[PDB]
Amino acid sequence: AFDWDAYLEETGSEAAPAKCFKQAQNPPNNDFKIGMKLEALDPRNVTSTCIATVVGVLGSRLRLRLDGSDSQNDFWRLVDSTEIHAIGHCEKNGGMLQPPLGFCMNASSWPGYLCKILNNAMVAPEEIFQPEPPEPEENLFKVGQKLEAVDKKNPQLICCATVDAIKDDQIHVTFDGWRGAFDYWCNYRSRDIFPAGWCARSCHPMQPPGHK
Numbered sequence: 532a533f534d535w536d537a538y539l540e541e542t543g544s545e546a547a548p549a550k551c552f553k554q555a556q557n558p559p560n561n562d563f564k565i566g567m568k569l570e571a572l573d574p575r576n577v578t579s580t581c582i583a584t585v586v587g588v589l590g591s592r593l594r595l596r597l598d599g600s601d602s603q604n605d606f607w608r609l610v611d612s613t614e615i616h617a618i619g620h621c622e623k624n625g626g627m628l629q630p631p632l633g634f635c636m637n638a639s640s641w642p643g644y645l646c647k648i649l650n651n652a653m654v655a656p657e658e659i660f661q662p663e664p665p666e667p668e669e670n671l672f673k674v675g676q677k678l679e680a681v682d683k684k685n686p687q688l689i690c691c692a693t694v695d696a697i698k699d700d701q702i703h704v705t706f707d708g709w710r711g712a713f714d715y716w717c718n719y720r721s722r723d724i725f726p727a728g729w730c731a732r733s734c735h736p737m738q739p740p741g742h743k
């Protein structure tokens with residue numbers, strides 16, 4: 532557990548208030564189990580809804596892998612992400628499940644492939660998907676404020692970070708102790724940012740500043 536209180540004191544800094552974030556007041560419970568299948572937007576084509584399997588759990592997050600793809604493009608979603616749903620959600624809504632972009636077979640093998648993987652599959656029930664947190668009505672972040680941020684280059688990691696700059700609805704996230712190489716701009720609505728103390732509360736590891 533990272534001592535934010537001591538760190539905000541020695542850096543003469545403020546943590547961005549919780550109201551800045553599209554996150555729940557309390558970290559949502561994670562009742563997902565490794566092996567459970569669900570529906571997710573393919574990060575490599577966000578128009579596609581694909582079958583994903585939980586290959587890891589960490590705090591309120593799921594590590595996901597798309598069935599029929601590869602093990603090199605896993606992605607992390609919170610249990611209250613709007614980009615994940617129970618199987619059957621896509622169809623109920625007038626849509627069709629797609630092969631992942633990294634699909635290991637030819638496309639005409641898809642319809643039969645879907646049947647094989649869904650056959651007696653462990654599926655996440657709809658009741659363990661958590662509700663979408665309320666969003667801020669505007670960008671309430673201020674320059675200099677600290678937070679917890681997913682390192683998008685190593686998304687398993689949530690790290691000590693600072694708001695460097697603000698342009699309208701975008702905030703510039705910088706990683707304390709790391710070269711500007713891990714910096715990024717994101718929307719203030721980003722699911723990848725959390726108030727200080729959130730990880731400790733969700734049992735997710737929290738990276739201290741880098742040694743640079």
Ligand SMILES: CNCCCC[C@H](N)C(=O)O
Binds near residue numbers: 685690706709738
């Ligand atoms: C913002 N977090 C940075 C983590 C980067 C870790 C990387 N493997 C390295 O050691 O460079």
